[PDB]
Amino acid sequence: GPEMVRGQVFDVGPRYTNLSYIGEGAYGMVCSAYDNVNKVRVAIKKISPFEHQTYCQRTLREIKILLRFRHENIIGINDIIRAPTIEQMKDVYIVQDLMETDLYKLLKTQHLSNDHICYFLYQILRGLKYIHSANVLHRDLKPSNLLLNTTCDLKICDFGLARVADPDHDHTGFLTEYVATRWYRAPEIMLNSKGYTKSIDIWSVGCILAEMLSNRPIFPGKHYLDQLNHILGILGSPSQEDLNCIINLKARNYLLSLPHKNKVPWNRLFPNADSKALDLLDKMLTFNPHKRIEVEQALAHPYLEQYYDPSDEPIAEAPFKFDMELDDLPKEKLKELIFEETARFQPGYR
Numbered sequence: 325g326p327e328m329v330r331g332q333v334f335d336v337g338p339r340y341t342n343l344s345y346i347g348e349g350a351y352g353m354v355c356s357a358y359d360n361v362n363k364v365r366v367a368i369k370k371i372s373p374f375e376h377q378t379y380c381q382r383t384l385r386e387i388k389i390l391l392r393f394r395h396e397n398i399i400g401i402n403d404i405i406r407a408p409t410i411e412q413m414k415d416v417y418i419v420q421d422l423m424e425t426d427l428y429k430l431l432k433t434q435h436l437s438n439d440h441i442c443y444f445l446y447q448i449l450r451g452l453k454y455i456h457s458a459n460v461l462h463r464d465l466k467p468s469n470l471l472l473n474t475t476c477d478l479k480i481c482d483f484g485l486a487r488v489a490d491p492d493h494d495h496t497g498f499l500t501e502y503v504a505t506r507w508y509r510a511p512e513i514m515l516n517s518k519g520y521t522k523s524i525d526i527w528s529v530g531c532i533l534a535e536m537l538s539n540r541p542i543f544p545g546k547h548y549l550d551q552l553n554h555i556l557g558i559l560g561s562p563s564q565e566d567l568n569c570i571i572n573l574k575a576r577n578y579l580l581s582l583p584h585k586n587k588v589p590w591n592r593l594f595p596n597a598d599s600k601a602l603d604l605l606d607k608m609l610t611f612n613p614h615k616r617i618e619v620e621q622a623l624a625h626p627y628l629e630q631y632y633d634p635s636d637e638p639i640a641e642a643p644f645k646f647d648m649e650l651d652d653l654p655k656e657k658l659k660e661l662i663f664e665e666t667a668r669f670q671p672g673y674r
């Protein structure tokens with residue numbers, strides 16, 4: 325019959341066998357398996373998105389982007405398995421390089437040395453440099469989306485919320501819904517931004533750097549608005565100039581309605597941290613997204629000086645483009661596009 329794991333068919337045989345559970349998450353079990361062709365254990369994520377129209381959006385953009393990207397610090401797609409017809413296609417299996425852990429799990433069981441933190445940050449920013457050079461935003465960076473192995477190699481994964489950048493259409497209203505993980509959301513997400521600019525990913529990296537420095541999320545909000553209160557709990561109330569930058573008056577008055585908060589100095593929060601790391605952290609976690617440091621400026625910061633090397637930091641061929649976007653297309657048209665996009669892996673084909 326068809327192999328299966330924890331009362332669930334993982335119909336990846338005969339090529340992939342000897343399965344073993346890793347974990348779940350984005351409506352999909354993840355297993356390792358032995359690839360009987362390439363003779364190596366691989367990771368396989370099972371995805372069932374065709375009931376819900378958003379899950380289809382997230383699946384298609386992920387596949388499309390990850391098939392186009394080629395970068396040491398970004399997880400690739402090695403194979404995609406699905407039924408040969410389509411009405412049979414109820415599941416999609418995406419085969420990827422097997423990594424050993426992720427930063428989230430690592431931080432649960434280890435305090436990182438400064439040397440380790442510096443190197444992990446470099447790799448995160450090296451990967452991000454590539455993504456942003458394609459004008460793509462990851463939009464959900466966090467420790468559990470950073471895969472690792474014992475040799476300290478790092479790969480960014482989970483491009484389900486990724487989009488082509490779009491600063492022209494970034495403006496949105498106060499309190500707009502959002503899907504990305506609360507603790508890593510830039511302040512402007514709660515104020516006037518849909519997260520369509522590169523500064524949104526830099527904020528998230530700053531959050532991760534703070535977490536590596538202390539093994540504690542720096543901004544653990546419990547609810548939507550509470551998240552913004554935590555951020556101001558460290559940054560302090562916004563400056564006059566920064567208040568004005570905010571366009572719509574609703575968000576502007578909400579900020580005015582908050583009690584004044586004193587800025588907690590970085591080296592008071594992290595007394596044992598490298599002062600160069602704190603200087604870069606300060607520039608990544610800046611309230612005003614226009615003043616926030618850019619990925620190449622972060623790579624060129626004194627903290628990363630032993631690694632920064634543009635000749636060893638690939639960039640993209642040219643800006644990525646979605647021929648048409650996916651936020652209106654019905655989930656049946658999306659399934660079709662997922663079908664064609666995955667056909668290149670169907671045994672046979674020319």
Ligand SMILES: Cc1ccc(-n2nnc3c(=O)n(CC(=O)NCc4ccc5c(c4)OCO5)cnc32)cc1C
Nearest residue numbers: 433434435436437438439440441443474475476477
């Ligand atoms: C409790 C506990 C604590 C710590 C550790 N580990 N594990 N590995 C290491 C390790 O490498 N360094 C030194 C270091 O800074 N290396 C950077 C580097 C590694 C590869 C590169 C590289 C740089 O440039 C290219 O390739 C220090 N401490 C470590 C393990 C456990 C279990």
Ligand SMILES: Nc1ncnc2c1c(I)cn2[C@@H]1O[C@H](CO)[C@@H](O)[C@H]1O
Nearest residue numbers: 347354367420421422423425426468
């Ligand atoms: N390619 C991989 N190698 C190793 N583990 C992986 C992956 C992938 I894709 C996902 N996971 C595991 O699923 C969760 C994502 O953080 C975690 O449980 C994470 O360990």
